[PDB]
Symmetry: C5
Subunit: 307 residues, 5 copies
């Protein structure tokens, strides 16, 4: 059972696709194992780049194909390198840019916590043939957190395991466990942009909605919530067109639903204030003055949606 | 007639193109058929990965090309593996990402039922040369329905059948039936996002539209439905910029039309109210008070569109 | 002069690009021609799939390149197959997906009739070297038009001709006419979406524009016409974002220009009615009541557009 | 010094990318030169299609690589052809699709004059080794300009010149001038769509803005200018979503700023009119009756854009 | 320790992706080194183009792969050229187009200062095997600055350095410093388009907002502030849709925030003016006439955000 020791060097994690639950990783794989000793020129290690690697594989060099289990599509492999040592050991070094897949929950956007994952697994060789000895992951990142969209928490957490593959086994009974390296990088979204540019003005819109009650006439009170309604639509349009695509409501979506709610609720009280009377124009002196009543009724219903 | 056994492993079904009637399928194919026995190194099955498979083919390994009938474009093939057993049998295993085509009706969106389909068929060998012995499909999915756009329902239908290509047959008469594997995976759309952020406020807009009759003045009444019209336009827009491209009207698309209708029907009633008179300002006390007439008249005419 | 029988089987015609004048065709080419008899294994027809065709060609197999004349870029090719019969004859079968070029008039959108074309031609052999014996095209489609964007009308037109490249001929004089196959598929656009979701409400906006004249005051008449204008801009905006980009105006675009007009004409009359007076508010006592005059005056200006 | 004759046949010029200063050119390249006499099968010219050309190159056939100096990326090449004549001469024919770069000024859009340029040059051979003997360009386009976005004007300009790369020469001193073919194709934009759907309504918006002065009251005069303001924004938007992305203002863009200006200037005058007084309500019966004054001040700013 | 002399020729720097922090570079690499003397045809340096380069490599030509350290994905390579001299020296020449990554701060857009960076380093060989003797960069760009998006300021930066990978060294101890060429080009953004088309009209929007205090009534003062609010939303939208996407606010983003605030402060002062009284309509003679107060109060807070 060949021991393969791995090092992944992560260069940039970028381009998160909310819809596809996808993110881009550029970096390097280094894979090392020990073969039977060789005679290299001089005595110095033999270097074999790109094209020539296939030539060595033809003359019988075992260079096992390691699949990125959760890569969507197949990665752009940059340069490849075989490092063949005379003491026997073999190093395969190559650059890759890949699009990777992971479960991503975006429901509390723009306050999501996500985690970026890599899954390596030898493509054709079982655990009894090729085994992952160890893995080091190097996230050569740090600093400039507010210039980048995401805050990396940890240093990269790792777990090597055995996967079975209990569908038709049968082919090779007793031996259908593959060893799998699983690298996880934890991360937090830097919400500033979304707070100041989406959350804040959506609030000023929402708040200023409640100023509909400081209007004197019923005609004023009502004709204005129609403009005010048109505003939340202008906003939802502005919001939706800019924000990441998801198949669900995020927190910001709910804020917008709440805007439609306060305003539609406003419409109802306002019409109600007017026509519920003991004459015709008996506008409920206190209900018309719910100018404080439901702004804080919104903030109570607001603090409960937080739970 | 070579018996070929297939097993398809479905990893991710994503990216439905509504206009193109398209979806993405990531997975693995395993194909097995049995040959004349080989003398393999050691005695354990021989592994041939990617490039070396072509090398084996140039030397006469029969690897029959299995075509994805309904793949739009030609799939992204990942690692390929030939697994050659001494008892003769041959296993072809490769990872694939493909764009598949199937008839998709999205009329009752966002509540569509869809079925993601795969059709396998040997590219050059007929039922009398190469035959599909059996096929199993494994969708090793589970959990997180409320996170995903699509909810898979069954375990996946399978069907092997025989296709008669009766166009110039003639070339090889009597032997022009190809055997076809058909996988069908049932699905339902996640209607939550479309309900809460589209259906709901669209209703509040349509509903608030009716509050125009609670206005005292005629000029207020009329000038108002023009802001109100401007609303359903800004809203139809927000919908169409965000919702999926189609060549037909969905349930939402209709709501928008009924939206335009209520307002335009209103405008007419309002002018009628005013100008159908025996003086100038004889507003039909009852017709100006059709505040209940067409709000509940909209629910009957609205629900008849459901039949 | 080698006789080539061609047969194209059309699977999907999708993805029309209105600015670039483009469409996608997925299907298969089958080309048949006859060589000197071969000694094939058994005596049965010899099959050569993908990778191997190029190999036979290094050993002198003439497999002439047939070019897609009006293809944009170079086609996505699926599986290749040579079918080599012992009596001499040779059949080439391949799958393709290509983006094709053709003149397309979209002036009468959403009611265009279009025709999707394939133009095949030998890439290197003239009419005296390679000639198209015949060509048949099978678009084994039918049914479900109300699901697809386009409705195919005919069964496909065919045309074999001779193309005379008379630019420097000279090199090989008297012999530079290549034989060309031309396929034609007629189609009609499915106007349903555009009828209900563009034409109808745009008609309602314009119609409701005319309701400006039932407004009592001048202040009312002119201000409401500003909202009216903004609704046509909001509509102008919703139209252009969803509708296909063209370098010319369609029918829907004109309805829009007509909209801005009916509204701008009213602005002018409305100011006129009021300021053309013998006192100050002498709205030409009758002209303000052109409530019927220019709506049907619009429909006549509308039918002058039948020309 | 090898004499090479070139002929380019342009099939389609399309897809102008304003931002990147790029356009697509599809066509064929033909190059002819005279080698040492050969013995071809029969004695008529030998044809070598695609794959097979490298094979001929591997055996010492000089097929010199001619680079498209201004191509963005590397061209999509379709079928390749070698034509080997017994008298020595060699013909290289290939189809290409390329994105080419040239300086493009889009300021006076939608009436720009652009020129599509192709630049050809041997990649590895200097003027003393390989020289462009002559070149002719064929624009086999014609008819129906009214359906196409761009109108090709001339019959294509041609220039063979010598480029002196005087950077370290040194390597090969006295000999580092490359021969360069320059093709120029002038064209004009189809101004129809933009005149009718941008300029005409952009104008009617700006014009109707001026009706603010026929409003009687000060509220009306001031408040409407705000609604009037929102319209130039909504119009600014539609303009921006549809029109080409540039790093500078176009004519229309300036038209839009002028819309914003006329309205902001009106805001001031309207306020000035009201408050420049000898009472409170000394509304300049005249400055409020600059109803003719500043529409022609706009026609003046309009004619100043020409100076 | 092989001396490699490098020269980069920059053709075009374009296509900057703000979210990915990406930009496109088209140009040429020249690499020169001296090997052991060769026997070339004639005595003139031998030319080996594209395809034939690998053929020389398979015969043992050392052609070391130079990695673009900071490239995103792997470059589109055009023509390659090997120039093999009799005296030993070898020149590698290739055109390339790549997307490169560099840290980009876009906080004070549109008044950005950026620097476009290229990083070269041998993929497999350290400082002791392969060393960069010198490098010159030629950016033969100039002029028409007001036509191109970015104004290249300095000439070109050059820095050869030694990178110490101190990760498992071990494998090759004492020798794991690679020599790195770093090219820096400074550039400044052309702020014209965003000034004249964004900054300016945004300013006129904000300013014309303050005129709400010149309105006589409270309803005039309040209701208009809502149309004023919807106008900022409209502008936010138009801005957002056109401007480059980033994860943080730029200057324009703040202007919009300031716009939202100014309107909300107005909603407040205005309601307050009205209800802070000793009667009911005692509109504070100074606070109603904060017509100068907070137009200038915005200018100090506007001037303090700059400092
Ligand atoms: C990464 N590597 C290991 C797994 N492979 C694989 O084994 O494929 C399928 C697979 N994919 C998903 C889930 N289960 C299975 C399974 O049981 N397979 C299988 C089963 C038998 C044989 Cl001979 C080959 N493959 C592809 C290459
Ligand atoms: C998957 N497969 C079966 C179909 N092949 C082929 O049959 O293509 C066509 C095809 N496509 C669609 C409908 N009918 C036909 C037909 O009659 N064909 C055909 C073409 C050539 C020959 Cl020799 C025999 N048959 C190619 C490979
Ligand atoms: C199908 N086809 C590809 C184009 N080929 C070719 O003929 O190239 C050009 C071409 N393209 C478009 C229009 N006319 C011509 C012409 O007259 N050509 C030409 C010019 C010289 C020689 Cl030797 C051969 N052909 C020939 C066969
Ligand atoms: C078509 N083409 C191929 C590449 N060639 C080349 O000359 O590239 C560079 C280049 N590109 C742009 C501007 N100047 C130069 C220069 O002086 N070069 C150069 C550098 C070294 C050597 Cl040996 C030869 N040429 C020139 C002709
Ligand atoms: C340009 N070139 C040199 C080095 N390569 C390389 O060094 O890969 C990794 C790498 N990438 C990023 C950061 N550090 C390292 C490291 O220490 N590696 C490594 C791992 C094993 C061996 Cl033998 C040599 N080097 C990449 C290609």
């Amino acid at each position: 059972p060949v021991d393969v020791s791995v090092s992944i060097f992560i260069n940039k994690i970028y381009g998160v696709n909310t819809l596809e639950q996808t993110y881009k990783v550029d970096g390097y794989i280094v894979a090392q194992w020990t073969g039977k000793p060789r005679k290299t020129p001089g005595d110095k290690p033999l270097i074999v780049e790109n094209t020539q690697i296939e030539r060595w594989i033809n003359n019988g060099l075992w260079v096992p194909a390691l699949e990125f289990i959760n890569v969507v599509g197949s990665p752009d492999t940059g340069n490849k390198r075989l490092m063949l040592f005379p003491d026997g050991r073999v190093i395969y070094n190559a650059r890759f840019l890949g699009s990777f897949s992971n479960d991503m929950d975006f429901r509390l956007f723009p306050f999501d916590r996500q985690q970026f994952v890599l899954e390596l697994e030898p493509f054709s060789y079982n655990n009894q043939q090729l085994r992952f000895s160890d893995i080091q992951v190097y996230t050569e990142n740090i600093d400039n957190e507010e210039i980048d969209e995401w805050w990396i928490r940890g240093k990269a957490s790792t777990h090597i395991s055995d996967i079975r593959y209990d569908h038709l086994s049968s082919v090779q009974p007793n031996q259908n466990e593959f060893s799998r390296i699983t690298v996880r990088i934890d991360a937090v979204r830097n919400p500033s942009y979304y707070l100041w540019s989406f959350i804040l003005p959506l609030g000023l819109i929402i708040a200023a909605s409640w100023s509909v009650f400081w209007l004197e006439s019923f005609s004023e009170r009502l004709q204005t919530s129609f403009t005010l309604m048109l505003t939340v639509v202008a906003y939802a349009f502005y919001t939706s067109n800019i924000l990441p695509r998801l198949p669900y409501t995020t927190v910001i979506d709910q804020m917008i639903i709440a805007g439609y709610g306060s305003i539609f609720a406003a419409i109802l009280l306002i019409i109600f204030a007017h026509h519920r009377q003991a004459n015709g124009v008996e506008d409920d002196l206190l209900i018309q003055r719910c100018r404080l009543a439901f702004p804080l009724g919104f903030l109570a219903i607001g603090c409960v949606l937080v739970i």
